Design a protein around this ligand. Structure first.
Ligand SMILES: Oc1ccccc1CN[C@@H]1C=C[C@@H](O)[C@H](O)[C@H]1O
Length: 331
């Protein structure tokens, strides 16, 4: 604070503005958070392994601290992924002899997991990401080949969405994914959510991760996604928004800060984005950034280990960037 407006305050009549957090920062940057955001997501501390490390042992301490942080300050909470190929302990898929678990073991284990997790924050979490990244990223492959698909069954998303809806039939359940604007994958996601809706599965929205960079997707490529998903009459949430200064499969490894060209493109590119989100504020009800400031971001270690990135509108010192001002809402 010193003379700058609240980012989430300027969108109060448009949509929530959230951030991906961690209990480690609730102390240091708790106030910066409680001022620009009215929604938050646990980046990792709420995933399978993080709260269900062993078959009979649960660990919710970190997650609880987050929810307690938010609800006290009138902030919304999105629960992140119940069913995902990553960050899921081995036991969940194994049997006594080290073999693979059966469809029945799978159904029981998943069921008890969902109840415990969704039920614990019942009526407190307004939105959940039941299934994360189920669609393949290879043009001629629909379903991503995973143990969920193999050991449980192709009807695993339905089960997930059904179980979740019982634990808290008031939460909005989303199907979350990335590359959602890629013309090919965009249709794969569309058909899945369409199949799900027909089968009667309780899906209430689609989760557009928003892991984009300063080059693409084009404004038209995003606009098309929005309209494509929005037509299914479901809510749209940009869930893991960030603007990478690199392209994926970027070989450039010597930057200590972004190139002047990178900053220019980004400031310009962010302005266009939120300008498009505002045009579509009817369809979009929540935009979350995968992080709070450039001081931290998973991009620093992925896909390149040890390569620092600056994907937000807040620099490494929690101070507003030139992109910040070109993004404040009309309210
Ligand atoms: O496998 C990928 C490949 C490219 C981009 C993103 C992903 C995964 N997308 C996200 C990354 C951050 C994690 O904290 C989130 O849980 C995850 O959903």
């Amino acid at each position: 604070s010193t003379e700058i407006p609240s980012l989430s305050a300027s969108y109060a009549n448009s949509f929530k503005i959230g951030a991906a957090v961690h209990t480690r920062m609730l102390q240091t940057e708790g106030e910066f958070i409680a001022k620009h955001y009215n929604s938050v997501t646990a980046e990792n501390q709420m995933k399978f392994e993080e709260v269900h490390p062993r078959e009979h042992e649960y660990t919710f301490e970190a997650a609880d601290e987050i929810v307690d942080f938010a609800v006290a300050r009138g902030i919304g909470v999105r629960g992140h992924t119940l069913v995902w190929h990553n960050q899921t302990p081995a036991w969940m898929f194994e049997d006594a002899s080290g073999g693979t678990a059966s469809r029945e073991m799978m159904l029981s284990r998943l069921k008890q997991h969902i109840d415990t997790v969704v039920g614990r924050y019942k009526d407190q979490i307004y939105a959940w990401d039941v299934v994360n990244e189920a669609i393949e990223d290879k043009t001629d492959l629909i379903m991503r080949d995973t143990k969920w698909l193999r050991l449980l069954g192709e009807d695993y998303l339905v089960q997930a969405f059904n179980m979740a809806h019982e634990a808290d039939p008031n939460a909005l359940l989303f199907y979350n994914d990335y590359n959602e604007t890629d013309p090919v994958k965009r249709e794969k996601i569309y058909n899945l959510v369409r199949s799900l809706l027909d089968q009667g599965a309780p899906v209430h929205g689609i989760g557009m991760q928003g892991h984009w960079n300063i080059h693409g997707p084009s404004m038209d490529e995003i606009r098309q996604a929005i309209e494509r998903y929005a037509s299914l009459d479901v809510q749209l949430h940009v869930t893991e928004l960030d603007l990478s200064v690199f392209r994926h499969e970027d070989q450039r490894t010597d930057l200590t800060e972004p190139t002047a060209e990178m900053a220019e493109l980004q400031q310009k590119r962010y302005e266009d984005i939120f300008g498009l989100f505002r045009e579509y504020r009817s369809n979009i009800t929540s935009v979350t950034f995968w992080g709070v400031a450039d001081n931290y971001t998973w991009l620093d270690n992925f896909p390149v280990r040890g390569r620092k990135n600056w994907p937000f509108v807040f620099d490494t010192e929690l101070q507003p960037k030139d992109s910040f001002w070109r993004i404040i809402g009309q309210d």
